[PDB]
Structure formats: structure tokens, C-alpha cells
Amino acid sequence: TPEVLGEDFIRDPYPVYARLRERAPVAHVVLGGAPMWLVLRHEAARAALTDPGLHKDPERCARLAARHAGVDPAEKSPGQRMLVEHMLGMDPPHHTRLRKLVAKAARQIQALRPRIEHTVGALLDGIAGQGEVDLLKAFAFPLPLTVISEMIGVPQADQAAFGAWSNALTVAVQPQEMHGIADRMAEYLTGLIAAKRAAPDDDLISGLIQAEDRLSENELVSMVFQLLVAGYETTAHLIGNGMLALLRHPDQLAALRADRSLLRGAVEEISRYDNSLHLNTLSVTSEPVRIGGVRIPADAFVIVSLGAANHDPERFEDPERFDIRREAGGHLAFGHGIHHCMGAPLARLQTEIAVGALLDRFPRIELAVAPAELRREMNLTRGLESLPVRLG
């Protein structure tokens, strides 16, 4: 019998991961009305992330997912193509080409730090004296929006409105509204490319065009999109997940206040504890695969649980405990294998420089509501909806 996963799972997963982790390293679950297999233990997850039998063909996925519901029916619109023609929806040998090209774009790697520190201080200089504030909508969500945007070259006057469409496509559930919102951005993210094919500047759009092979408009849009959205939501959610733990456990907060030698290691324990992504990109199966010692059939969905793996009592000690002073090296929070977050270095830098600056200016940073008045959203992205901190 396939176990069913409900609204309770979405909000509070890590208990469920722990109940099923002891039973077996992989489980048969029902997430989204879709029977899939869930990889929970650390080694099993590492291995499922290094196996070619797990294919990321969104084309095959959608048709297979519609068949569970019975609805068995094209002109793929711009926005439909934007959502499915990025690295994460592609398998080798075609993934290798794309990842080469996007990495070939530039010493823009350096000077990323100055930008972050600048925009951090700008954001922080605005909330000073404002008493109680929502840290998420004033520091966390504003920062990566400004950081990733200036890398891609999204003009300042256009940055914020792109964040709303990002946020809405995240909150949106129905396919219709998604494809509609996506067609909206896809057009803007085409003039933005077009301006830069005529005005080569010092941004990542200009350099993605300039990279033999080249990246087609199809993949230039798709890549400029994926870097924008995934470097906005998941980055900004890691900050807010991390600060909730840094405010929920106060003893460690003050250790980090005096000793900035802990700043580096804490970021790893933030990613390890509550990561913004506790789940893999779905992947279907071309052939029968053996992961965790359990046979997974062909034409069957497989997701890897990055949360349960990070919380496996074999890999880590008291895996459900926030200790900024742990050998947390080895987390699967940024993925493993051919995929693996290309922009993980930027996520660590943002959080590292963010958390330090918050503690620097504000030594009375504290939560202004009971931990009970805080509520998490119904997304596979572990979010908080609100973080009402009380600076002092």
C-alpha cells in the first residue's frame, strides 16, 4: 500500500522522514496524487544522485503524471518552453553542453562580494530604528533579488516587479496560471537578451550570448530564468529558515556574535538543519534501477529527500539538533552528482555575509512573536511566510 503524504507532510516533513527512514532506505509514497519512490537514507540518496537510470525528462514526466489522473489528450508557448529547457530538465549527453557554456561566462565571480556587502548594508540601513520588522520581506527576500539580478543585468527599475512574478509562480498551483505568468516573463526575458546582444555589458546575460557552439534563444531565456528564480526564492528562504534557528536557539547566537570563526560552519548547519529545498527535482526511470537495495521499476518517479539524508542518524550525530559547531561537512543540501547547485558558492556567501551583518549592527535581534504565531507555507520549498523580528 503506498503511503499518502498530505498537508501535514508539506508543513512538517522531517518527522515523517524519520518514521520511514528506519523502515527502509527507500519508500513508496504518494505525493501529489502521484505514486513515486522516496530516497531517505544518506548513502542511498548519494547513490541515487549518481545513477543514470534516474532521468529528468519533464516531457515524459508530465504525460506519466497525467495518466494517473486518466486525462490522456504541442504548440509549446514561450513560457512552457522556459520552464522545461534548463539544465535540471535535461540528461546527458545534452546536459554536459549546457553546463559547459553557462560556466564559460568571467571574473564577474570576483566583485560579487563587494556587491553583496553593499546591498546588505543598504537594506540594513533602512530598517534601523523601525522597531519590530518582518526580516523576511526587508532583508532576506530583498537581498538575493538585488544580488542575482545585478549579476544577470535586470535593470534596477525592473527588478522588484520581476520578484512579484517569481513569487506568484511559486505560490501558483494550477498549470494555467503558471504558464500564463511564465509567458509574461519569457517576453521580458527576451528584450533583456535582445538589448544585450546589441549592448554587450558586464552582466551574465551579455556573457551567455558571447559563449564552436552557442546557446539558442530557447536556452538563453530558460537559463536566465532558472538562475533568477532559483537564486531568489531558495536563497532567500535559506536565510529565513536559518535566522529562525539562530533566533530559536539563543545561546549559539551569542557564540556567533563574539566568534566570527563560527560564521563559516554555521551556514553548513543551517543548510543541514532546515534547508529551503528538502527535495530533489523529480526524475522518472528509463529502466529498472536498484537504489538502497530496493528494486525501483521503469516508468516510475524517483525523488531524493535531501532533508532525511541530512538528518540520517548514521551520517550525523543527534541529527535533529542545531550545533553551529559540528562537522556538518557532507550535507546533500546543494545536491550531488552531475546536477549539484552551480551557484552554491553564491548562496553560502550571501548567507555568510548576511548573518554577520545582522548580528553586527543589532545585538538585541530577537523574535517578537511566540514561536507558535509563526506558520509555514504549503510548498515543497520549506518557507516561513513571516519572520517578525524585534531589533533593538
Q: Which range binds ligand HEM by CB under 6 A, 116-124, 167-175, 338-346, 353-361? A: 338-346
Q: Which range binds ligand HEM by CB under 6 A, 17-25, 28-36, 308-316, 340-348? A: 340-348
Q: How far is the CB of 373 from ligand HEM (least distance, A)?
A: 26
The residues, ordered by sequence, that sit 6+ positions from 213 with a Cβ below 8 Å of its Cβ are 97, 101
Q: Which range binds ligand HEM by CB under 6 A, 19-27, 158-166, 231-239, 287-295? A: 231-239
Here's the x/- map for ligand HEM, 25-44, by CB under 6 A: it reads as --------------------
Q: CB nearer to ligand HEM: give 179 or 336.
A: 336
Q: How far apart are CA 240 and CA 273, in angstroms?
A: 13
Helical axes 233-248 vs 250-258, angle rounded to 10°: 100
Q: How far apart are CA 216 and CA 244, in angstroms?
A: 42
Q: How far apart are CA 135 and CA 123, in angstroms?
A: 10
**Contact call for residues 208 and 101 (beta carbons, < 8 A):** yes
Rule CB under 6 A: say whether 285 interacts with ligand HEM. no
What is the DSSP-derived secondary structure letter of residue 367?
A: E
> Nearest-CA neighbor of 292 among 52, 17, 48?
48
**Contact call for residues 155 and 183 (beta carbons, < 8 A):** no
Backbone angles phi, psi at 132, to 5 degrees: -60, 140
| CB neighbourhood size of 311 (10 A) | 24
What string of H, E and C letters represents the secondary structure of 313-346? CCCCCCCCCCCCCCCCCCCCCCCCCCCCCCCHHH
Q: CB nearer to ligand HEM: give 58 or 343.
A: 343
Q: CB nearer to ligand HEM: give 248 or 340.
A: 340
Residues 302-321 that bind ligand HEM (CB under 6 A): 306
Q: How far is the CB of 277 from ligand HEM (least distance, A)?
A: 5
Q: How far apart are CA 25 and CA 38, in angstroms?
A: 9
| CB neighbourhood size of 353 (10 A) | 19
**Contact call for residues 284 and 299 (beta carbons, < 8 A):** yes
Q: Which range binds ligand HEM by CB under 6 A, 159-167, 244-252, 311-319, 339-347? A: 339-347
Q: How far is the CB of 338 from ligand HEM (least distance, A)?
A: 6
Q: How far is the CB of 276 from ligand HEM (least distance, A)?
A: 5
Q: CB nearer to ligand HEM: give 238 or 391.
A: 238
Q: CB nearer to ligand HEM: give 220 or 391.
A: 220
Q: Which of 45, 65, 333, 391 binds ligand HEM (CB under 6 A)?
A: 333
Q: Which of 289, 347, 384, 387 binds ligand HEM (CB under 6 A)?
A: 347
**Contact call for residues 182 and 82 (beta carbons, < 8 A):** yes
What is the radius of gyration, based on Cα positions, of the chain? 21
Rule CB under 6 A: say whether 227 interacts with ligand HEM. yes
Helix (H, G, I), strand (E, B) or coil at 211: coil
Q: Which of 334, 354, 367, 384 binds ligand HEM (CB under 6 A)?
A: 334
Q: Which of 108, 190, 281, 386 binds ligand HEM (CB under 6 A)?
A: 281
Q: CB nearer to ligand HEM: give 302 or 359.
A: 302
Residues 95-154 that bind ligand HEM (CB under 6 A): 99
Q: How far is the CB of 231 from ligand HEM (least distance, A)?
A: 3
Rule CB under 6 A: say whether 206 interacts with ligand HEM. no
Cell of 93: 549527453
Residue 254's alpha-carbon distances to 96, 246, 263, 369, in angstroms, are 45, 9, 12, 20
How many residues line the site for ligand HEM (CB under 6 A)?
26
Q: How far is the CB of 70 from ligand HEM (least distance, A)?
A: 28
Q: CB nearer to ligand HEM: give 31 or 391.
A: 31
> Nearest-CA neighbor of 229 among 140, 304, 169?
169
Q: Which of 280, 285, 305, 310 binds ligand HEM (CB under 6 A)?
A: 280
Q: How far apart are CA 299 and CA 285, in angstroms?
A: 5
Site residues for ligand HEM per CB under 6 A: 87-88, 99, 226-227, 230-231, 234-235, 238, 275-277, 280-281, 306, 333-335, 339-343, 346-347
